């Protein structure tokens with residue numbers, strides 16, 4: 001079975017920070033799952049004091065494809081809970097800075113956490129032997145160390161850079177790390193000779209686009225801002241922040257030529273009278289107004305690349321290696337590998353059969369084949385032939 | 398004469414970042430000054446492309462007490478300019494991150510900068526021997542190293558934490574460092590036995606208040622946000638940021654009990670629907686609505702302390718040592734020393750006679766006496782008697 005690690009520590013002030021993934025795995029479960037989480041995930045449902053959370057909004061639930069769980073849905077699974085006493089102790093060891101504590105959680109081993117994880121996993125006979133893989137929504141060396149000791153893999157699974165409603169939902173699934181420490185570039189370098197894609201970058205974009213593209217004033221430079229306390233601005237940012245990204249761009253452009261888009265999820269917006277502030281209804285319309293795009297490691301950087309815009313990527317991220325290739329054909333081949341083999345159809349990373357498939361480490365050809373089968377499900381070979389044919393069927397339907 | 402160091406490097410994207418201090422020293426000058434700066438400070442006046450800067454707004458000029466300089470005003474002084482080629486090289490050595498480059502400038506020696514400074518100071522005979530002291534608006538180990546070699550002191554001078562129109566204008570003057578690395582606590586520990594002030598914290602506040610206090614709904618916790626790229630959020634913050642300060646407070650209070658005030662100077666404001674956002678006309682009205690106040694190292698933390706509010710200070714700053722005393726009488730005595738001896742009447746830090754006075758390192762009693770003489774100028778002893786009498790004359794006039 002699966003062992004799904006969803007830490008309860010409220011590093012950013014919100015209880016059950018990864019609730020949506022708990023609900024998604026519960027809703028998709030065709031077998032019993034082991035959940036390694038906190039009591040907050042179990043007690044938020046009934047609380048009826050948190051019920052205004054976005055995870056309970058039927059529009060969010062529809063976009064992500066889940067329904068709230070019932071006593072019946074939850075009874076099928078096993079739950080291990082981590083205590084908060086360790087969280088308070090963790091904060092005490094990082095000058096009571098919750099964000100620095102989160103950084104340590106993401107990037108360093110925490111031996112006291114490893115001990116509690118080991119204890120929980122040993123709390124009942126047979127729990128460990130029935131674990132086929134761990135799953136984590138973020139990097140966590142503590143868990144990854146525990147997994148080595150036990151001989152288990154760790155799939156790092158997260159929502160991907162292309163999301164509904166603009167795009168088909170995608171997910172990350174990476175055995176080495178998610179956002180930071182990823183294996184996308186390594187996987188591509190191993191199979192790059194198998195990719196001969198007869199499509200442009202914009203064609204790859206159009207395959208994943210689920211809406212009519214927005215209507216076509218240009219700004220020399222577009223600046224993508226991110227959520228200030230998302231893990232990849234804490235740990236994988238190469239020290240850059242929204243404010244230093246802005247300063248970076250100002251070294252190269254006068255303010256009249258800068259267009260800044262705040263992240264709709266950020267707690268902060270921009271003051272109305274310094275820069276030109278983007279007000280597009282989505283990030284695609286924003287980047288279409290820009291001649292070149294600057295980002296730390298936002299998902300929007302991938303959108304910029306795929307629409308052919310000169311993009312600067314200052315942080316670490318899964319897609320950066322696409323942008324570091326010289327040839328136009330090489331960039332397309334890398335993008336095609338990224339989109340059809342590295343990224344996973346979102347629902348499949350919650351499907352136990354697909355997860356067991358990936359746990360066998362199959363060939364890139366088989367992975368691409370299973371993804372295209374899912375993407376083609378409602379439609380009326382080698383690897384390139386599969387991708388080329390898939391693009392062509394969208395070409396005329 | 399004075400040697401006034403005003404670096405031209407646009408770490409935050411703005412040319413001549415310390416223009417106001419250039420104009421203030423020029424306007425107040427009763428003798429020839431040596432300016433160590435950049436061409437941008439000399440070429441911004443006529444540029445008439447920057448003229449919308451706040452340094453040119455007559456209301457700002459009045460608040461800070463200066464007028465724009467003329468060809469005549471500037472002719473009296475000597476100017477050494479630093480080249481930009483070093484700035485571009487500096488950026489190249491810190492991953493092209495201007496904010497990290499600014500951090501290095503503030504906190505580390507930069508040997509190539511020391512060489513250019515030495516070269517400029519040697520560029521004309523007799524320049525060095527006529528320097529009585531350096532002045533810098535910020536910490537700069539490069540300059541401070543040069544000064545040691547040459548046998549010169551470095552006065553660190555900056556606008557203070559109490560400013561017009563709410564308060565009498567104050568300034569910092571610190572031989573060791575401004576904001577970070579300050580000598581306020583050290584100076585107080587040396588003279589603490591001389592302070593026996595028969596006044597409350599609120600009385601000290603009222604002495605510096607220049608307006609009728611705002612009219613008296615309370616929030617359990619007020620959160621002071623700062624300018625995201627001010628030096629003391631870059632270098633003296635103990636790694637805290639606005640966003641981690643907010644997370645810190647959320648570990649202790651639910652959002653309904655938090656009141657957040659953005660810095661009017663910040664480029665960012667808060668989204669309207671997460672926290673309760675303060676909209677007070679000034680920071681005093683904001684802290685009056687709060688039962689306890691949280692800050693990294695804002696000037697507003699001093700206001701909170703002086704109005705008697707429980708204050709948490711997470712970064713390094715000049716006033717923190719006041720907040721770390723236990724006794725109510727000890728806190729008043731430290732505050733009185735801070736306000737009357739450490740802080741300087743703003744205009745005096747631009748007055749060459751006062752600067753030569755301080756360069757003699759006089760006793761705390763003489764310093765307090767000169768400050769009270771300035772504050773008392775428009776009014777119709779030992780150290781405590783001077784401060785007590787000064788407070789009492791405000792008591793009835």
Ligand SMILES: Nc1ccn([C@@H]2O[C@H](COP(=O)(O)O)[C@@H](O)[C@H]2O)c(=O)n1
Nearest residue numbers: 224225226261262263264283298299300
């Ligand atoms: N400045 C920004 C950053 C992100 N976003 C939206 O958020 C999604 C995820 O972006 P991050 O990877 O930046 O969190 C993007 O696909 C886009 O839809 C935006 O619309 N404007």
Ligand SMILES: Nc1ccn([C@@H]2O[C@H](COP(=O)(O)O)[C@@H](O)[C@H]2O)c(=O)n1
Nearest residue numbers: 621622623658659660661680695696697
């Ligand atoms: N959150 C904040 C921070 C500062 N301020 C104003 O800015 C001045 C300087 O504050 P900093 O030291 O935070 O830059 C304060 O005296 C206050 O007048 C404010 O009004 N609200």
Ligand SMILES: [Cl-]
Nearest residue numbers: 168169374375
């Ligand atoms: Cl799909």
Ligand SMILES: [Cl-]
Nearest residue numbers: 565566771772
């Ligand atoms: Cl005064």
Ligand code: NA
Nearest residue numbers: 206207208209
């Ligand atoms: Na499509």
Ligand code: NA
Nearest residue numbers: 603604605606
């Ligand atoms: Na007064």
